[PDB]
């Protein structure tokens, strides 16, 4: 059977993402990972309180 | 020298073309089990799911 993506739960796409930056630490991707990982702990911290 | 050059050479030429067909045999044996198990059977899963 198929499933997506967004079955899987958000905190192993980010921590995938994360290791992503971690091999790419470029400026530009590094910030990018700041700014989402601060809009997950934000917006989805916040849903999850 | 026509049994060695000619008859075996075209023998050998035989057979290695028939282990080509085998060998296309067999990769069409496997285009159709990534089709009928395989691609029809996820799009019947796909369209099970859809």
């Known amino acids: 059977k198929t499933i997506f993506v967004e ?4 905190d192993l796409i980010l921590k995938v ?5 971690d091999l790419w630490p470029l400026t ?7 700014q989402l990982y601060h809009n997950y702990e934000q917006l989805s911290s916040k849903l999850r309180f | ?7 075996q050479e075209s023998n050998r030429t ?15 044996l496997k285009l159709m ?3 009928e198990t395989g691609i029809m059977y996820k799009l019947e899963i796909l369209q099970e799911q859809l």
């Open chain 1, 17 to 21: 993402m994360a290791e992503v930056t």
């Open chain 2, 14 to 28: 035989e057979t290695e073309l028939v282990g080509l067909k085998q060998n296309l045999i067999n990769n069409k």
């Open chain 2, 1 to 7: 020298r026509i049994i060695s050059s000619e008859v």
């Open chain 2, 33 to 35: 089990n990534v089709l």
């Open chain 1, 7 to 10: 079955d899987f739960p958000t």
């Open chain 1, 28 to 34: 530009e991707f590094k910030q990018d990972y700041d």
